[PDB]
From a paper:
Shelterin is a hexameric nucleoprotein complex responsible for maintaining the integrity of the ends of our chromosomes, known as telomeres. Human shelterin consists of TRF1, TRF2, TIN2, RAP1, POT1 and TPP1, binds double and single-stranded telomeric DNA and is involved in a wide range of functions. POT1 binds single-stranded, telomeric DNA with high affinity and specificity. POT1 telomeric DNA binding is mediated by the two N-terminal OB-folds of the protein, while the C-terminal portion of the protein binds TPP1.
Residue numbers in the entry:
A (entry chain A): 332 to 633
B (entry chain B): 266 to 326
The structure:
């Protein structure tokens, strides 16, 4: 049995790789190939962030980076910003033996009242990563903020603009034009906290988590390099959750080991059935053809 | 009061005396920290970008 199946375009005839490589882009194809090799070999490096608007691809900040950002963000003097009284209630806690740091927590109100904890959005200034993670478990969502000159503002977009459960949402630094926190007032519906609604209110273009991989595919007629840029179709594992979950990570590892079992020859690898599109890439003076996998998923008996 | 309860819940997540604790680290997160000495795998964004014109031709198929 094939290791992957098409989720669409099943009517297509199979095209051999040698024929694809001789043809002009853009075209769509069905293929059957062995996965000869892939990048990244270090699978933990496959998780990237991609902007749907400007097309940039970037790294997800390391956990250690966030830890440092939040440590560096410690403040002795957080503001409530009193003009925002109808938006949120606020509390500030003092500390012992923590260099006089303070934590401000702002509790966003739904329709004039504080909602249940699981429905409550928090804004936090001066919290550690560990505190933010705990708050994200007990409340609906956390937005890290800092005291600006006039209003509360998001931290640098290198920190998540929203943490909801264990999902860290990031914004594009090129495409966003940040609005201050008071603009959360423009949300008429605060009965749920939809990440894209928070993002629009704050002028953020959210980045999308993707698995990015380079598949070297071989059917014996030729070798074709095809990119995978997958949010959750291919592995049936959400790229937005994978970095926070040992079991999801283990599943991706097991899928890839299944495509390329160690110490056996390529003929003994499973076939991958894939749909691919070809397209033209220009990096200055010369043209190049590239290939991407679409409408393809891992099969049931892994 | 409910406000009081939310404030107590929030407080319970905070570490207000001495050093703060360590957030959980998954095996990929730990590995991402240890992968040194070779440029991290990436693909230039332009290699992944299918132009509007190419997308037009492709959608008609
Ligand atoms: K939305
Ligand atoms: K051959
Ligand atoms: K075989
Ligand atoms: Zn962008």
């Amino acid at each position: 049995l094939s290791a992957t199946i098409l989720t669409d375009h099943q009517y297509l005839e199979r095209t051999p790789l040698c024929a694809i490589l001789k043809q002009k882009a853009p075209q769509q194809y069905r293929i059957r190939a062995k996965l000869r090799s892939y990048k990244p070999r270090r699978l933990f490096q496959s998780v990237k962030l991609h902007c749907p608007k400007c097309h940039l691809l970037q790294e997800v900040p390391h956990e250690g980076d966030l830890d440092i950002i939040f440590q560096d963000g410690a403040t002795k003097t957080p503001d409530v910003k009193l003009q925002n009284t109808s938006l949120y209630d606020s509390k500030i806690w003092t500390t012992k033996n923590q260099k006089g740091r303070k934590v401000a927590v702002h509790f966003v109100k739904n329709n004039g009242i504080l909602p249940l904890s699981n429905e409550c959005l928090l804004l936090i200034e001066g919290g550690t990563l560990s505190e933010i993670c705990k708050l994200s478990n007990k409340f609906n969502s956390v937005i890290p903020v800092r005291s600006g000159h006039e209003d509360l503002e998001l931290l640098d977009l290198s920190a998540p603009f929203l943490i909801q459960g264990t999902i860290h949402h990031y914004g594009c630094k090129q495409c966003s034009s940040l609005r201050s926190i008071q603009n959360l007032n423009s949300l008429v519906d605060k009965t749920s906290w939809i990440p894209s609604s928070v993002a629009e209110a704050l002028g953020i273009v959210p980045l999308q988590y993707v698995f990015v991989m380079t598949f070297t595919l071989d059917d014996g007629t030729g070798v074709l390099e095809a990119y995978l840029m997958d949010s959750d179709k291919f592995f049936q594992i959400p790229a937005s959750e994978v970095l926070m979950d040992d079991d999801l990570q283990k599943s991706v590892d097991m899928i890839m080991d299944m495509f390329c079992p160690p110490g056996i020859k390529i003929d003994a690898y499973p076939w991958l059935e894939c749909f691919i599109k070809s397209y033209n890439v220009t990096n200055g003076t010369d043209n190049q053809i590239c290939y991407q996998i679409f409408d393809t998923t891992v099969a049931e008996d892994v | 009061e409910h406000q009081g309860a939310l404030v107590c819940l929030a407080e319970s997540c905070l570490t207000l005396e001495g050093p703060c604790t360590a957030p959980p680290v998954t095996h990929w997160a730990a590995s991402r920290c240890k992968a040194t000495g070779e440029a991290v795998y990436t693909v230039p964004s332009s290699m992944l970008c299918i132009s509007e014109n190419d997308q037009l031709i492709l959608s008609s198929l």
